[PDB]
């Protein structure tokens, strides 16, 4: 039951289900203590049973329990743990992650097969904890907190911050992702190249594997952090290392529309 | 009484409690029929149950009847003035002791909490809970700078004397967690109350000199 950005309160539907169960349970205790007739007790026991059922699994038996003033069924424990929006599929089998970005993709023909065009502003935010350390290493900032405050304002960023940024990303790779990830090559590791602009530059040869054209696609960028994660991306997930299709064994990064036409 | 926060069966069971109370207090000597007297108790029970169980954040009867009276007065003014009344008009019609501030406070009190699972948009994949950040647990940045401040403070206190650093860490509660007093700190070292505030001040002054010479601790003050 959290107060929100303003002053009003926001609470979950489980509190309402718990309250009804407690209200009916307490009322049954009072009714039993008063020597109520069997019809009143039987109705209260039945309502207590239904309150437990609604809390455990709302809508499984009888009409779903709805918040007064609305027709939306209350979310029970079973609803929380089951379904596409349940705990498993939404928070356990898949999660939202930090150090992740997204932008429109454009074609980069001058890129190598293992390279991608990462915008400077995206790389600054994606590699922020690494960048803050590097600025601390050089004379850009005295400590991490001063470095972070410097990066808070766009006009307060000097030209040496960018120079530190390329030192940060040297050798490191990022994961480019386009949804839906139908096969495993829907996520590939690329060596980022800092470019001016806001769009990601994608190599033409990896378009077929990603099923990505340039009529307005968007891609997700992910930054592996440790040496284990970097080694896996650089060795196993690198785009230049996945040239054949795991489904058929035939080449998947091969000449395409404009390349075939020219040759 | 349906549609006032309690289901139909909840209203009946609460009224049954009032009916039981009516039987206990009913007197047939007055020659009045039972329904005449039982109707009072049943309606009293249903209304009290509504005042006590129809809100997630419980509001007392006296404030609930005030909220209900406030809503009734607002409706009467709204239908007479042909528009939504302002707080001044509602306060004036309510009576003495009521101003626009009190009306606004009561309306703010009468705000029901909103469900965390209410969807937004036709797509059934977004709820209020997905847009409310958790501001209780410290962020990774906040936890880091706290660790950065702690390591820089323990390094700055090393330049102090062995006892002088102990006094500041004890007077500022860096050891036991809680701030101690000069008398309490005095019992630890067997020192009187007055002497410690001087060595605490002297140790504080030396840290000020060190910080002014290095400036490795100013940034953490924000």
């Amino acid at each position: 039951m959290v107060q929100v950005d303003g002053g009003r309160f926001a609470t979950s539907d489980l509190n309402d289900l718990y309250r009804r169960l407690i209200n009916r349970n307490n009322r049954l205790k009072k009714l039993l203590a008063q020597g109520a007739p069997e019809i009143i007790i039987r109705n209260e026991k039945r309502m207590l049973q239904e309150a437990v059922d609604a809390l455990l699994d709302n809508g499984r038996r009888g009409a779903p329990v709805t918040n007064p003033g609305s027709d939306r069924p209350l979310r029970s424990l079973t609803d929380i743990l089951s379904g596409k929006q349940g705990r498993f599929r939404q928070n356990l089998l898949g999660k939202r992650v930090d150090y992740s970005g997204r932008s429109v993709i454009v074609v980069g023909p001058q890129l190598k097969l293992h390279q991608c065009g990462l915008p400077k502003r995206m790389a600054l935010e994606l590699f922020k904890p690494f960048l803050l350390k590097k600025m601390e290493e050089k004379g850009i900032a005295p400590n991490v907190k001063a470095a972070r405050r410097m990066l808070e304002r766009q006009r307060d960023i000097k030209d040496e911050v960018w120079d530190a940024l390329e030192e940060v990303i040297h050798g490191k790779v990022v994961l480019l992702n386009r949804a839906p990830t139908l096969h495993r090559l829907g996520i590939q590791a690329f060596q980022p190249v800092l470019v001016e602009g806001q769009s990601i530059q994608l190599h033409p040869l990896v378009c077929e594997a990603f099923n990505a054209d340039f009529d307005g696609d968007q891609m997700a960028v992910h930054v592996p952090l440790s040496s284990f994660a970097q080694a896996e991306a650089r060795i196993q997930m690198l785009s230049a290392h996945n040239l054949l299709s795991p489904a058929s064994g035939e080449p998947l990064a091969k000449p395409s529309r404009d390349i075939i036409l020219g040759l | 009484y349906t549609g006032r926060g309690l289901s139909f069966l909840d209203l009946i069971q609460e009224g049954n409690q009032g009916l039981i109370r009516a039987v206990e207090k009913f007197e047939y000597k007055r020659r009045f029929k039972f329904s005449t007297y039982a109707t009072w108790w049943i309606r009293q029970a249903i209304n009290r149950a509504i005042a006590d169980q129809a809100r997630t954040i419980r509001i007392p009867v006296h404030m609930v009847e005030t909220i209900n009276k406030l809503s009734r007065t607002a409706r009467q003014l709204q239908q007479e003035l042909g528009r939504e009344p302002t707080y001044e008009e509602i306060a004036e019609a309510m009576g003495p002791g009521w101003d626009a501030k009190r009306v606004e406070e009561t309306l703010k009190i009468a705000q029901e909490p909103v469900s965390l699972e209410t969807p937004i948009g036709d797509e059934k994949d977004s709820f209020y809970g997905d847009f409310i950040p958790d501001e209780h647990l410290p962020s990774p940045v906040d936890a880091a700078t706290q660790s950065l401040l702690s390591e820089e403070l323990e390094k700055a206190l090393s330049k102090l004397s062995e006892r002088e650093a102990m006094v500041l860490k004890l007077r500022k509660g860096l050891i036991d967690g809680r701030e101690h007093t000069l008398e309490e700190v005095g019992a630890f070292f067997g020192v009187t109350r007055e002497r410690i505030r001087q060595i605490e001040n002297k140790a504080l002054r030396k840290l000020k000199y060190h910080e002014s010479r290095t400036r490795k601790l100013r940034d953490f003050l924000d």
Binding site: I39, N43, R46, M47, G62 | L9
Partner: peptide, 16 residues
């Protein structure tokens, strides 16, 4: 009367 409708079931019970 109706097993799935608690209100109708209660009304039947009090009707006896």
């Amino acid at each position: 009367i109706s097993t799935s409708d608690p209100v109708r079931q209660y009304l039947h019970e009090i009707g006896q």
